[PDB]
RNA sequence: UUAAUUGCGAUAACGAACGAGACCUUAACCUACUAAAUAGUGGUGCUAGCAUUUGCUGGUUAUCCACUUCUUAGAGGGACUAUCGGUUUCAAGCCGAUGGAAGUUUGAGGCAAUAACAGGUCUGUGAUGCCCUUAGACGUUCUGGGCCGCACGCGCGCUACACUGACGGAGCCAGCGAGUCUAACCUUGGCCGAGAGGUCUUGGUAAUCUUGUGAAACUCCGUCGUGCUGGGGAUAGAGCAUUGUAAUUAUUGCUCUUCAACGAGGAAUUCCUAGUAAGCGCAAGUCAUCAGCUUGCGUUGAUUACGUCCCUGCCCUUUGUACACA
C-alpha cells in the first residue's frame, strides 16, 4: 500500500492502548505514528472523542486539536 | 494613449468631462409655466419641463 | 518671417497684453527645421492660470 | 418624547448606521443578534466595546445596526465603531458630559479606530503599473 | 428624443466642435474668433464671432 | 555563559558602504562609569541596551 | 462573575470578560515576565488585546511597531511566501490553534512561551558585508524582527509538503526555541549567523 | 519641506509694517485680519501668510 | 420567546431545516439528481449526492424569506462561484439553472414559497409559520 | 536650511521674467447651513410570522406625518506645523510631545521652463514639400489566400508545482462603469435545458431598470491524506450550442474521455516604503464573436528601511584635459 495506511479492525485494537498517554493528539500525530493515513486517522478521532479516551479543546475543521482523558 | 503613433514611453491621458443635472418639483397652474419656461434661457445648461407631472 | 511675425506681436502688446509669444517652426532658409521665437512681455507656462488667462 | 441618537460608523467604504435608544438590551446587527458575524473570530472585534465599559450600561438601551459596503472585515470594524459612537454619544446627550467623559477615556484608553476613522484611503492606479505604486517589469535587452 | 443626456451633451459637443473647425476653414479670411451656439425654444442660435462683419 | 548588557547614551551617524551600519556609543550597566563606542546592524534609538559577547574591543568606522 | 441579562441573551463566558480581564479568550498579559532584559520596551505584553488582528498604523513612522502586540507581529509574519499575503483570518486562526497547541502540550501560558521563544531566536551578533565580512552588534529592534522572521519562515518550511499542519510545525518551533533545543530551523539557525560572526569578532 | 516661500514670507513683512496695531499673536483673529485687509486670491495662501505674520509678531516682542 | 429565522446561526439551522425536509417526503427530487454538479463551473457533482437538495431547499427557503423576493437569476448568481478555466484567469460563471428553478418549484408545491408579484418568489404564512418552528426547535434542543 | 536657484543671508551688484512653489482636480472631517417619492430613516395605518403585555423579525416604489444621522451636490468652514518643549550665531529651519478627521508639499495626480535629439510618426489626419504611378493602376471594389505559417532564440504575461492546499456543500459582502427609436443596447421575471444556451414577456434614453451588478479571494462543516496524488491541466477524440454571408488552419462557450511538463527554478535581471507590496476578482476600451492585454476600482492586506554613496545614475561647486558628430 503506501506507508502502513491500510484499513484494520486489529489496528483499532493497536490504536486503543497506543493513543492513551498522549499528551496531544491530532490527524498528524496518528499519521506520524506510521499509523493509519488521514482519512482513518479522523474517523478514529471521532469513535475516541464518543468513547471518552479523548477531552476536544477546539475542534476547527481542517485542524482538530484534543487531549488525554482526565 | 497621448502619442498619434505607438513610440515612446506608455503614458496615458485621462480626459473627464462632467454633466451635472437638477431636479424641480414646482406646484405651479398653467399661468406661470408659460412665463417661467419661456425666460430663464441661458448657454451650456438646457432645461426641460415634465408639464404631464 | 521676422518682420510679419514681430508686426503681430507688437500689435497684441500694444492691444493691452500682459506678454505674447510667437514661435514659427518649419524649413526656414533652405531645408532644414528652424524654430525662430519672438516673445515680449510675462508668458506663464504651468499650472491653471494657463486655462485662465493665456490663449494659444 | 423618547431617548434615540441616529449614529454612524465606517472602515474604508463600510456605512455602518446605529440607532441606540431608550430599551432593554436589545443588540442586533441586520435585524440578527450580534452573536452572529460572519467571520466568528471578528466576533470579539464586534463585541469589544461592550466588554470594555461593561453590559451594565447597556441594561437600560436597545442598538440596531445597518452595514452597507465594503468587505466581511470593514464592515465588523464599521459595527464596533458605530456602537461605541452610538453609545457615547447617548451618553452625552441623555445623561451628562461626566459619564460621556468616563466612557470616552475608557474606549480611547484601549486603542481606537473605534470613535474616529482610519484616515487611510485607496491611492488611484497610474499607467505603467498593476496599482498605486507597483511598476510593469522593464525590459533593457 | 429619446437619446440620453450622458450621451445627447457630447453629441451637441460635437455639433460644436464640427461647427467650430466649419467656419475656421470657410470665415478664417474675413476674421474668426470662435462660435457660439445658444438653445432656444423654437430656435437655436449660432453666433460668429469674426472681424469685419461688412464681408462677414 | 558571560554576556554584558550595555545601554546607548548617543548614537553617531552611520559607518559602512551604505548606512547599515550605526556607530553607538554604550555605558555598561553591571560596573557603570565605562563608555565604550561600538557598532550595531539595526534600527537604534537611545536608551537602548545593547548584548557583548565582549566588552573588550573598541569599534571603528567601516570605510 | 455579575451574571447581567440583556434582550440579547449573551454567552456567559462572553460575559466573564467585560473588565474582567482581556485575554484571547483564556490567555492572560497578567504576566510570566519577559525574563531577558534588552527586550523588554521591544515587546508588547503590557496592553492586552481579544484577537491577533487590529486594523493598525504601526508601520507609520519608524518605531510605531515596537509598540504593536507581539502576537500580531506573529500573525502578520506568517502571511509570506506570497500565495498567503493578506489573509490576516487564516494566519490569526492559525494563531488561536498553534497557541491551544503549545497549551495543550507544555502548557506554561502559550503567550510567554511565544515571548520566550523570541528571546532565545534573536541574532545577538551578525556580519555585513564591508568579499569581507565585518562583524557588529544588532539593534534590539532588528533582534524582534529576526527572531519573528526565523521562527515563522522554520514553520512554514517544515509544513511545506507534509501532513504535520502550519500550527503544529509553528507550534513545535516556538517550543524547542522558548526550551534551547536546536531542532526547529531555530537556535541552530541563529547559532549559524553567531558562528560567522564569532570568525570577526 | 515646511519652508515658506518669498511669495508669502514678503506678503507677511508688507503687513507688519503696515498693521503692527491690528495684528494680535493669534492665527486664527491675524487669519480674518488678512480676510478684511488684505484681497488673497486662495484660501490656503492666507492660511500661510497669517500664519507666518504670527510667527514674527511672536519673534517681534522678544 | 420571539426566536425568527434570523435569532438562530445559519448553518446550525440550515442542517435541523435539512433534517425536517428529509424526514417529511413532501418535497420532490427532478430525477436527474446524482447526474449534475450545480454549475456550468465545477469539477464534480455535490459529494453527499444522497438529496443534496434539502440543503439547497432548505437555503433557497432561507435565502427568500431574508429576502424580498428572489429571482431563478438571483439564486444562479448567488450559488455560481470561480470557474478555474484552465491556464487562464479564474472567472464569475454563475451555478445550474435546472437546480434553482425546480426546488423554487418543489417549495411552491409544498407551500414554503409563493410566486410574488413584481416578479420572482416570496415566503408564504405557512412558509414563515414552518421556517420559525424549527427556528425555535434548534435553539432549545441545545438550550 | 529646504522636496526645491525653497529660503535666511553674505554680497558689483541693483531691480526683474520663466520654471519650483503658488494654482487646479481629487480622497478623506463637517450630530453646522441649504433640499431631497430618481437617497434614506424614525413614525403612525393595511398587514405576515413567533410570542401573548407591553415585545421581536418582515412586507407593502399610488396610505399619510416628520427630519437629513447615513447617501447626493451647492455655498462654505477646517490646517497655518496650531500649542508646548527642545534645538541652530536662538535666522530661515529641523526634531519630540499634545490636540485634531487630517501634522510627509495632509495622500494621489493634472499643469509643467530654456535648450536639445538630424528620438517616433509622411500607416491618424482634404497636415504637407519633393519624388513615383496615373487604368494591363501603386487608386478603391470583388473572390479566395496570408498577417496565426515552425530546427531555433529573446521580451511582457497567465497557470502551477499543493494540506497556509484541492474538491463538495453551505456562509455570503464591494467600488468605479456602461447601456437601444427607426434602432436590436443593458436585459429583470416565469418556463424549457445537466449544459452552454433557448423561448414568451418586462424595467430602463437611466441616483428610478439591469443592480444591493448579493464579484472573487474569504468564512464555516465535510470529503481527499505527503502519491506527478483527487496538485497541474497541456495536448488530443467525439458530440451540443451561440455570434457571424462565412467558424476548415479548430472564434468563443459547454459535456464526457485522453492525461504531458512542472517537486519552487542556473548565470542573471525587475518592481516596491502603507491602505503601499502582494493575493483576489470586478467594470470600461477595441467588441458581431473573441482578453491570458490595457485603462480604472474596490476586496483581503504584510514583512522590512525611515537610511547611504558601495553599484547604476542625477544636481551644484572645485579641478585636469591633446575631447567638441564632446
Redesign the interface.
Known amino acids: 500500500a503506501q506507508h502502513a495506511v491500510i484499513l484494520d479492525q486489529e489496528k483499532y485494537d493497536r490504536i486503543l492502548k497506543e493513543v492513551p498517554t498522549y499528551r496531544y493528539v491530532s490527524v498528524s500525530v496518528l499519521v506520524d505514528r506510521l499509523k493509519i493515513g488521514g482519512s482513518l486517522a479522523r474517523i478514529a478521532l471521532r469513535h475516541l472523542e464518543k468513547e471518552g479516551i479523548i477531552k476536544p479543546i477546539s475542534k476547527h475543521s481542517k485542524q482538530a486539536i484534543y487531549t488525554r482523558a482526565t | 494613449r497621448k502619442t498619434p503613433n505607438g513610440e515612446g514611453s506608455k503614458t496615458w491621458e485621462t480626459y473627464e468631462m462632467r454633466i451635472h443635472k437638477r431636479y424641480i418639483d414646482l406646484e405651479a397652474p398653467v399661468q406661470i409655466v408659460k412665463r417661467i419656461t419661456q425666460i430663464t434661457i441661458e448657454p451650456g445648461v438646457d432645461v426641460e419641463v415634465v408639464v404631464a407631472s | 518671417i521676422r518682420r510679419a511675425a514681430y508686426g503681430v506681436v507688437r500689435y497684441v502688446m500694444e492691444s493691452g497684453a500682459k506678454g505674447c509669444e510667437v514661435v514659427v517652426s518649419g524649413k526656414l532658409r533652405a531645408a532644414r527645421a528652424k524654430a525662430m521665437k519672438f516673445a515680449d512681455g510675462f508668458l506663464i507656462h504651468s499650472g491653471q492660470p494657463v486655462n485662465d488667462f493665456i490663449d494659444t | 418624547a423618547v431617548p434615540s441618537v441616529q449614529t454612524f460608523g465606517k472602515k474604508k467604504s463600510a456605512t455602518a448606521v446605529a440607532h441606540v435608544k431608550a430599551g432593554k438590551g436589545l443588540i442586533k446587527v441586520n435585524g440578527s443578534p450580534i452573536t452572529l458575524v460572519e467571520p466568528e473570530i471578528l466576533r470579539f472585534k464586534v463585541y469589544e466595546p461592550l466588554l470594555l465599559v461593561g453590559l451594565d450600561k447597556f441594561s437600560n438601551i436597545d442598538i440596531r445596526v445597518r452595514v452597507t459596503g465594503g468587505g466581511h472585515v470593514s464592515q465588523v470594524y464599521a459595527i464596533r465603531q458605530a456602537i461605541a459612537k452610538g453609545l457615547v454619544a447617548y451618553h452625552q446627550k441623555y445623561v451628562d458630559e461626566q459619564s460621556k467623559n468616563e466612557l470616552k477615556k475608557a474606549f480611547t484608553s484601549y486603542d481606537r479606530t473605534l470613535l474616529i476613522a482610519d484616515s487611510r484611503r485607496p491611492e488611484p492606479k497610474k499607467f505603467g503599473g498593476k496599482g498605486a505604486r507597483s511598476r510593469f517589469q522593464k525590459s533593457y535587452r | 428624443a429619446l437619446i440620453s443626456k450622458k450621451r445627447k451633451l457630447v453629441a451637441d459637443g460635437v455639433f460644436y466642435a464640427e461647427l467650430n473647425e466649419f467656419f475656421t476653414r470657410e470665415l478664417a479670411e474675413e476674421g474668426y474668433s470662435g462660435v457660439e451656439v445658444r438653445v432656444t425654444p423654437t430656435k437655436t442660435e449660432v453666433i460668429i464671432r469674426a472681424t469685419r462683419t461688412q464681408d462677414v | 555563559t558571560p ?1 554584558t ?1 550595555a545601554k546607548v547614551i548617543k548614537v553617531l551617524g552611520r559607518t ?2 551604505r548606512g ?3 556607530q553607538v556609543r554604550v555605558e555598561f ?1 553591571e560596573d557603570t562609569s565605562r563608555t565604550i563606542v ?8 537611545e ?8 566588552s573588550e574591543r573598541e569599534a571603528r568606522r ?2 | 462573575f455579575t451574571p447581567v441579562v440583556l434582550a440579547t441573551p449573551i454567552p456567559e463566558e462572553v460575559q466573564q470578560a467585560q473588565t474582567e480581564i482581556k485575554l484571547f479568550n483564556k490567555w492572560s498579559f497578567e504576566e510570566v515576565e519577559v525574563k531577558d ?2 527586550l523588554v ?2 515587546v508588547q505584553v503590557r496592553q492586552p488585546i481579544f484577537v491577533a488582528h487590529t486594523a493598525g498604523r504601526y508601520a507609520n513612522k ?2 510605531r511597531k515596537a509598540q504593536c502586540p507581539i502576537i500580531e507581529r506573529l500573525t502578520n509574519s506568517l502571511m509570506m511566501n506570497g500565495r498567503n499575503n493578506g489573509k490576516k483570518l487564516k494566519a490569526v486562526r492559525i494563531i488561536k490553534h498553534t497557541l491551544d497547541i503549545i497549551n495543550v502540550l507544555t502548557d506554561q501560558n502559550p503567550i510567554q512561551v511565544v515571548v520566550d521563544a523570541i528571546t532565545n531566536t534573536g541574532p ?3 556580519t ?3 568579499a569581507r565580512r ?1 562583524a ?8 524582534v ?1 529576526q527572531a519573528i522572521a526565523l521562527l515563522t519562515i522554520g514553520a512554514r518550511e517544515a509544513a511545506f509538503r507534509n501532513i504535520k499542519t502550519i500550527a503544529e510545525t509553528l507550534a513545535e518551533e516556538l517550543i524547542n526555541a522558548a526550551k534551547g533545543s536546536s531542532t526547529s530551523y531555530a537556535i541552530k539557525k541563529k547559532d549559524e549567523l ?1 558562528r560567522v560572526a ?1 570568525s570577526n ?1 | 519641506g515646511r519652508v515658506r516661500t518669498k511669495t508669502v514670507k514678503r506678503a507677511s513683512k508688507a503687513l507688519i509694517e503696515r498693521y503692527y496695531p491690528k495684528l494680535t499673536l493669534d492665527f486664527q483673529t491675524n487669519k480674518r485680519l488678512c480676510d478684511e485687509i488684505a484681497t488673497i486670491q486662495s484660501k490656503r495662501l492666507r492660511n500661510k501668510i497669517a500664519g507666518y505674520t504670527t510667527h514674527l509678531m511672536k519673534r517681534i516682542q522678544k | 420567546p420571539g426566536v425568527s429565522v434570523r435569532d438562530v446561526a445559519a448553518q446550525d439551522f440550515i442542517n435541523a431545516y435539512a433534517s425536517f425536509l428529509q424526514r417529511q417526503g413532501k418535497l420532490e427530487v427532478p430525477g436527474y439528481v446524482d447526474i449534475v454538479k450545480t454549475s456550468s463551473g465545477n469539477e464534480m457533482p455535490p459529494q453527499d449526492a444522497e438529496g443534496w437538495f434539502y440543503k439547497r431547499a432548505a437555503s433557497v427557503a432561507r435565502h427568500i424569506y431574508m429576502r424580498k423576493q428572489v429571482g431563478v437569476g438571483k439564486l444562479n448568481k448567488l450559488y455560481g462561484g470561480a470557474k478555474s478555466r484552465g491556464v487562464r484567469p479564474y472567472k464569475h460563471i454563475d451555478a445550474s439553472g435546472s437546480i434553482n428553478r425546480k426546488v423554487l418549484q418543489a417549495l411552491e408545491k409544498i407551500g414554503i414559497v409563493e410566486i410574488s408579484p413584481k416578479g420572482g418568489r416570496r415566503i408564504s404564512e405557512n412558509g414563515q409559520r414552518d421556517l420559525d418552528r424549527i427556528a425555535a426547535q434548534t435553539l432549545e434542543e441545545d438550550e
Open positions: 554576556v548588557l559602512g558602504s547599515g551600519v550605526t550597566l561600538r557598532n550595531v546592524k539595526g534600527p537604534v534609538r536608551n537602548d541596551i545593547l548584548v557583548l559577547m565582549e567601516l570605510r | 532584559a534588552s520596551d521591544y519608524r518605531f545577538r551578533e551578525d555585513t558585508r564591508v565585518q557588529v552588534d544588532v539593534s534590539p529592534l532588528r533582534r524582527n553567531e564569532k569578532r
